[PDB]
């Protein structure tokens, strides 16, 4: 009922950006072939 | 409305800054991973030189390779930089404005890493010889692992920060 | 080596389904975003 | 490259939303102006 | 678990402490229209009855 | 933030100085009917009671 | 050298500007009400 | 030979990514240009 | 009104102004 703010594209974009991280992690883990590529994934397993 | 728009713009800028900090942390982690690989290779070389079946020239060659690896470690430690500021040569902290308001930030502990800080300077397997070589190497590797882990949680923290910030901008 | 491979080496059968799910969710998000950007168009109908 | 893209690149979703918004505002403004620019004829309709 | 060593426990504890201080940070620094929503036990009223 | 370099701070400070200069300029040289409004601390008195 | 609390000072300046605008906003409302009252009074007189 | 090929030959991955980027950019630009031609149309409705 | 202007600073951009007036790398 208002055009100055969509009020829905914002939520949709937030959801898309949330899914983007999982998509990127999956794509990286496919090519790497290793579970923990960086300490961001599991800093505890890196030392082990 | 003025207060609301000021808050929204500040939050967007803070999210951008947090992403920049994530990039910095990732670069530093890559440098640390390179140093770690070099340390693992030099540890294997020390395990090789530990036995007594090798002749003196073999110890000399192993020591030359060890010294080359140490020089490479020092080089990648000193020459690494991101956006004009070094990462592995200064013991300061990196403060990232993520709260969109005065004061509140997130700190990144940067430690000066080189052949001296890690110890085992003048390793000298050939000559004299280090008292406990494998012990010092494991100590250096443990220090590298501690730095990576302490830096590893930072980007997860910053991702949580940017997610919460996006939610806050949406609601505002 | 077996122990470290238990620690590292994320299984591919899980990650392929993970990336497939992520792709499907991203496609659905793009579709619903294209749908959502259309609801403010009806405001023009109120004028003329 | 990732950092620079964060700085200089534009995520197309925001720009498509802004284009649609500005286009709707422009069309609404033109439509309302088509009537706003014509209310002096009332004094003409008086005579 | 009992298979990990001491250093693994220290690393897990560093991660836990980072998460905990981030919890405290996001709690204390989340505000709306000049009031902190997660830093006080007070209550706000919404005049809805006219 | 702390991630930006010294030259980054230089550029941002130059832009901030430009905006402050513009603020002072528009505060200085805007007037209505030949009298300035944003430079004189007095108050305009308008007779409306006839 | 650098300002101690830059965001605080900027918020204070924005608050001063908003206060001035709010004080200016009500005056023209009063003037419009006075205009309407004067029109009615002139008609009746 | 490998030192020479390090210069002349192109990494096909970056080149195909650049090709896709250019295609998408051209399509988007042509779309917004087509949509930008109707902007001067409202003046004839104003004359009515 | 007279005196109400905005100044646009300019610089003389040239290789000599930039520096090294014939910067070279082949000695």
- What is the full DSSP assignment across chain G? ---SSHHHHHHHHHHHHHHHHHHHHHHHHHHHHHHHHHHHHHHH-
CA nearest neighbour of B23 among B110, B104, B83, B75: B83
List, in sequence order, every residue forming a beta bridge with E31; answer none if it has no partner: E36
Q: How far is B54 from chain E (nearest CA, A)?
A: 34
Sign of CA dihedral C13, C15, C21, C23: negative
d(C-alpha C37, C-alpha C34), whole Å: 5
The answer to whether B78 contacts chain A (CB < 8 Å) is no
CB contact under 8 A, D28 and C41: no
Distance from CA of H41 to the nearest CA of D (A): 10
- Tokens read off for B108: 């990144």
**DSSP secondary structure letter of residue C40:** G
Minimal C-alpha gap between A44 and chain E (Å): 6
Confirm if B95 and B106 have CB atoms less than 8 A apart.
yes
**Residue C10 burial by Cβ neighbours in a 10 Å radius (0-12, 13-18, 19+):** middle
Q: CA-to-CA distance for B113 and B70, rounded, in angstroms? A: 12
Whole-number Å distance between alpha carbons of B111 and B107:
13
Number of Cβ within 10 Å of residue B23's Cβ equals 19
Smallest CA-to-CA distance from B157 within A45, E26, E28 is with E26
Considering only CB atoms, which chain D residues are within 8 Å of B28? none
Resolution given for this structure, in angstroms:
3.4
Method: cryo-EM
Rounded to whole angstroms, the Cα distance separating G11 from G18 reads: 10
Q: Answer whether B27's CB lies under 8 Å from B154's CB.
A: no
- What does each C-alpha distance from B161 to B107, B164, B166 come to in angstroms? 13, 5, 9
C-alpha Rg value of chain I to the nearest Å: 18
Contact F3, B94 (CB under 8 A): yes
Mutation for G interface: B2, B13, B99, most G CBs within 10 A: B2
Q: Is residue C16 less than 8 Å (CB to CB) from chain A?
A: yes
Contact state of A47 with E7 under an 8 Å Cβ cutoff = yes
CB atoms within 10 A of CB A38: 19
Q: Residue A30 and residue C39: Cβ atoms within 8 Å?
A: no
Alpha-carbon separation of residue A32 from B140, B146, C12 (angstroms): 27, 23, 11
Whether C47 and D24 lie within 8 Å, measured CB to CB: no
Breaks after residues in chain A, judged by C–N over 2.5 Å: none
Q: What are phi and psi of E31, to 5 degrees?
A: -135, 160
Chain E adjacent subunits, 3+ CB pairs under 8 A? A, B
Run of H or E residues at C21: helix C12-36
Q: Residues of I with CB below 8 A from F21's CB? A: none
Q: Give I4 to chain F, closest Cα distance, Å.
A: 7
β-bridge partners, B86:
B81
Contacts of B101 (CB under 8 A, 6+ apart): B10, E29, G7
With contacts defined as CB-CB under 8 Å, which chain B residues touch A21?
A: 159
Q: Residue B93 pairs with which residues in a beta bridge?
A: B109
Tokens of B138: 């494991």
- The whole-angstrom separation of Cα B67 and Cα H46 is 82
**Tokens for B69?**
């690896």
Q: Is E in contact with D (3 or more beta carbon pairs below 8 Å)? A: no
Q: C-alpha D5: how far from its chain's center?
A: 29
Pairing of the two strands E31-32 and E35-36 = antiparallel
Q: How far apart are CA C25 and CA A12, in angstroms?
A: 11
Which neighbouring-strand residues pair with B85?
B82
F38's tokens: 């944003």
**The dihedral sign for the CA sequence B15, B17, B20, B22:** negative
User: Distance of CA A33 to CAs A25, B17, C8, C12, C16, Å?
Assistant: 12, 31, 9, 8, 12
Contacting C residues, span 1-48, partner chain D, CB-CB under 8 Å? 33, 37, 40-41, 43-44, 47-48
Residue bearing tokens 């939610």: B167
């Amino acid at each position: 009922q208002v055009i100055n703010t969509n009020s829905l594209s914002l939520i949709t974009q937030n959801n898309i950006n949330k899914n983007q991280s999982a998509l990127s992690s999956s794509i990286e883990r496919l090519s790497s072939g290793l579970r923990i590529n960086s300490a961001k994934d599991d800093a505890a397993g890196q030392a082990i | 409305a003025n207060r609301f728009t000021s808050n929204i713009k500040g939050l967007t800028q803070a999210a951008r800054n947090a992403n920049d900090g994530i990039s910095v942390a990732q670069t530093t982690e890559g440098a640390l991973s390179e140093i770690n690989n070099n340390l693992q290779r030099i540890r294997e070389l020390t395990v090789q030189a530990s036995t007594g079946t090798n002749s003196d020239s073999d110890l000399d060659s192993i020591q030359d390779e060890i010294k080359s690896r140490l020089d490479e470690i020092d080089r990648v430690s000193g020459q690494t930089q991101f956006n004009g500021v070094n990462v592995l040569a200064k013991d300061g902290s990196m403060k990232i404005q993520v709260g969109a308001n005065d004061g509140q930030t997130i700190t990144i502990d940067l430690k000066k890493i080189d052949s001296d800080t890690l110890g085992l300077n003048g390793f000298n397997v050939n000559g004299e010889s280090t008292s406990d070589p494998l012990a010092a190497l494991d100590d250096a590797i443990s220090q590298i692992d501690k730095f990576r882990s302490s830096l590893g949680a930072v980007q997860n923290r910053l991702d949580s920060a940017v997610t919460n910030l996006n939610n806050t901008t949406t609601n505002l | 080596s077996e122990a470290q491979s238990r620690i590292q080496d994320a299984d591919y059968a899980t990650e392929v389904s993970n990336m497939s799910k992520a792709q499907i969710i991203q496609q659905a998000g793009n579709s619903v975003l294209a749908k959502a950007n259309q609801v403010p168009q009806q405001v023009l109908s109120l004028l003329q």
